[model samples]
Target: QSITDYNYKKPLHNDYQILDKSKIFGSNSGSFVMYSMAADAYYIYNEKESRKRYSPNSTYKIYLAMFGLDRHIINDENSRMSWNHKHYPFDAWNKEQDLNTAMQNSVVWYFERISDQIPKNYTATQLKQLNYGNKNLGSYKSYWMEDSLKISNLEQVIVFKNMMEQNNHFSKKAKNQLSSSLLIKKNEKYELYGKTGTGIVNGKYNNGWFVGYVITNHDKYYFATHLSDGKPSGKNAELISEKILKEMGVLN
Candidate 1:
C-alpha cells in the first residue's frame, strides 16, 4: 500500500483498541457499529447483541427518502414537506422543506411530515424491501428529540458490506446510488461518501456516524467509523473517521 510494500511487517494486527465503551459512547446512546463491504467480505466488532438494533435515527433518513421516492409518496425532489411547529412533545413539521435539504441537515420536520403522511404500512413495506426500519417510525416524529434512534457500528459495517458487495436484497443500482450520494468526492482513481449523526439522548450527547470508501483501478476498499460520546461537532471527532480512511489506504 502507498509507496511502501503491502506485505506484512511483523504481525500486523488490524485491530485498534476500541475506546472504553462507556466513556466514549456515553450512557444515552444504545449501541454503535461500522464495517466495509466487498464481495462476500464480513468484518465487524460487537455485532451479535440484540440491543444493537435500536432506533436508526436520521441515518434511516436516507432509506426513508429513497422509499418515498420509490412509492411515489412525495414523487419529486421538490415535494413540500413540513417542519416541526413545536419543539416539545414531537410537534416538528416542516410544511416547506424538500428531501435534499431534509437529508443535508437531518431535518426533523421534513422527515416527520413525510413519515406521517405516508402510511406506516407503506413505509414498513419499503423498509422490508430495503431491509431496515422494522419498528415504529411514528414515534420518531416527536420523540426524535430524545434520541430514540439506535444503530451500532457493527450494523453500519454490515450495511457497508451489502453496498460494496451488493449483499442482502439491495440492488446494484441502489447501492451505487447510495455510494454516489454518500461520497464526498470521486475521480478516476477513487470515490468517497459519508454520513454524520449527532443527538442528545437522556442528557448525554451521542454521536453516531459512517464514512469511507475508495475505489482504485486495481483494488477497492471501504471504511466505516463511529464515535458515541464525542460531540457531533468537533475537529477531534473527525479524526476517528479520518484514521479509518487513512488506515484503509484511502486518504493521504
Candidate 2:
C-alpha cells in the first residue's frame, strides 16, 4: 500500500454523478476507469478511489488462473477437480468443477483447492513476477480476500492491459484460455469479459469489484469498477460497470 502516495496524478476526469443513479452502489465510495486501446485514452471517475487499494476478493481468481495455467499447475481450461461433496451454502458449488465453471460461478472451494496445490511460496513468486499490488500473501489462503493482498482499480487496468498486449510474457495458449474463461456476455459485434468480487471487512459487507475488458473486432477497452461501504454483492460491481460503460457508449 505504500509504494506511492495518492498524489500520483493522471489526466483523470471525474463523473461521480454517473454513479449517483446506481441504487446498489450510488451511496458508496467507488470508482471506475476505462482505457481505450485504439485511442490510448483513459476515462476515469473518482480519481482518488481509483488509485486506492482494496482487497481483491474473487477477482484475484483471474491471477490464480493465470498462474495455474502458466505454471502448468492446472492443465487447461477444461481441467476439472474432484469435489469433496461437502454441503455448503451455495448449491451451485456442491459438484465437481472445471476451470471455466469454477470461474463462472466464483466457486471458492475449487480455487482454494487449486491454491493449495500451487502452494504459498510459489504463488508469492508468481505474484512478484506479475508485480501484483502489496505482494503480501498474509496467510496463503486468505490473502487476496482477507487483509493482505490489495490492488487499486488503476492497477487492475494495468495488469489486464499487459495481458491483452502480451507484455506480461504469458504463453499464447494460457492468455487465450484465461480470456475465454472470463467472458460474461457477448454479441455479434462485441464481447464483454470480466470477473466480479465481493468481500466483507470487520464482519460487514463492504467491498465489491468488477474488472476486465471489452473486445470488438478492431479494438479493446479495459475497465475496473469498485464499490465500498455499501450492500456488497458480487453483482454490484458488474452492474455498475455495465451501466457506466453503456453510458460511455462502449457497450452498444
Candidate 3:
C-alpha cells in the first residue's frame, strides 16, 4: 500500500568468473550484485567495491519513469511528448517519444522535459522518501548525470527488488507501467528487464551501468552491475550481466 521502505541484506560472496567475460577485468574496477527471490540468496563480485557509490547516469530514468507516473506528469505509459527540435547525436533520440520509446532509446530530452515541469523540491522529497542513494540532486535538472546523485550497486538491487515486489510506497499504476516498459525480452523459460547507463565526468567517459532483473518460470532475480575506470558502454554492462545470469542458469 505504501512505498516500500529502504532495506538491504548482507550479500554473501560467490566467486564467479562472470567479470572475466567482460572488459572489466582489464579496466580499473567493476562491481556486481544479485539477489535471488526464491532462495533468498545474495551473490556479489567485488563485494567491497559494490558498496561504493557512483553516478547512476541513465539508470536513474527507471526512477524518473515511476516518479513521473506517480505524480501524474504523464497520462500513462503511452503518453507522448513532441520533440523540442533540439539536435541530438543519436538519431533515435531526435523525434517524438512516449514513455516506452523514450526508455527504450534512452532519450535524454524526454525525461529532461519531464523533470523540468516537476518542482525540484518535489523530486527531492520523493528521492528522500524512496531513500535513493545519496538523495542528492545537486542540480535539479541534471542530478543523475555526472552530478551529485549517486547509488551503489547494492542499493540499486535493493530498490529494484522492492519495486519488483510491487508492495512499496509507489502506486500500482506507476509500478505496472514501469514494469511493462522494462520488459525487453521473454521466452518460454525466462523474462528479462533492465536499464543501461553511461556517465561522463569532466569530459571523459568513466562509468557504465546495467541494472534490472529476471523472472524465470519458477524464480525471480534482481541484479546490478557497475563498471568503472575506463570508457565502457552500457552494452558492456548488459552483456556481462547476461553472461553471468546465463551461467547461473537463470537465463536460457
Candidate 4:
C-alpha cells in the first residue's frame, strides 16, 4: 500500500504527570504538553484534551519549510517567492518574500506555492514517520488549514521532540535551517524558537497554536499549546504559552 499507518514513537522520558497549569489558562479551552529533558519528565495539562486532535493550521508551515529545504526546492540563502498580485491582510505578503520574511509573517501564499513543489509521496512518508496527527496531507492549499491534517497537543510535542532528535527523513542542515527560521525570542538565559497558527475554518477562526522548543544553558524543552473554542487566535496562544514558559522559568 502506498499509504502507511501512523507510527507514533514514545518519548525517551516516560515520566508523565499532570502539570496543574489550568488556572493560568483561565477561560480559554485548550490543551498543553511539555517535555523537559532537564526534568526528565513529560508535563501535561488537560490530559484528555491534550490527546484529542485539531487542525494544525498555519503551524504546518514549519514542516513544509523543512520539506522544501530538504528537497532543495528552497534553500537558506535563496528561498524567495513572488506574489501573484493578490491582496492579503498583511502587506508583507502582498509582495515578494524570502524564507525568513515569509515564515515570520506566516505568509499563506508563499507556503501555498512551496507546497506545490514538494512531492506528495515524500510528504506522506515523512508525516507517517513523524507520526503527525492523521498522517493525512489532505488536498493541496487547504490541507493544513482545517481539512485533513490534525494534531493533538501531545502529538505536536512528540513531533517537535522528534524533529530535535533529527529524524532520518530530513537532513541536519535542513532541520537546522528550519529551526533557524523560527528564532522568535532570545535572552542571556534561553532562546525561544516557535511558530503560531490560527485555524480559520470557512472564514471562522476555530483554534490557535503556539508550538516549538526552547534551548537554555541547562536543558531543552519541547512544548505544544493551543487555544480552542472561544477567543482562540495565534496572538492569544502566544500570550498563554509565553506566560506558562516564563512561570516554569523556561523563558525569560
Task: Give TM per candidate.
Answer: 0.61, 0.87, 0.87, 0.91
Indicate which candidate wins on TM-score: 4
* lDDT by residue (tens digit), candidate 4, 58-89: 88999889888888989867887778998888
lDDT (10s digit) by residue, model 3, range 112-213: 888888888888887776657777777576778888778888889876786658576687878878988888899999999999998876777688899998
Candidate 3 accuracy as lDDT: 0.79
Show where candidate 2 strays beyond 4 Å: 1-25
Evaluation by TM-score, superior candidate among 3 and 4: 4
TM-score between candidate 4 and the true structure? 0.91
Q: lDDT by residue for model 2 over 11-67, one digit each (tens)?
A: 445232223334434666687888888877777777677778778899999988987
Ranking by lDDT: 4, 3, 2, 1
State the C-alpha lDDT per candidate.
0.47, 0.78, 0.79, 0.82
By descending TM-score, how would the candidates be arranged?
4, 2, 3, 1
Q: Compute the lDDT of residue 9 as modeled in candidate 3.
A: 34
Evaluated at residue 105, the lDDT of candidate 1 is 57
Q: Write the per-residue lDDT of candidate 1 for residues 1-252, one digit (tens) a residue.
A: 122111111221344323323343343233333332333343443333312333444566666555555555665444555544555442223335665555555666665665666766765564445344223344545433334434444444444444446455445554554454555667765665555555556666554554445566655655444444436421333445555455545553
lDDT (Cα) of model 2: 0.78
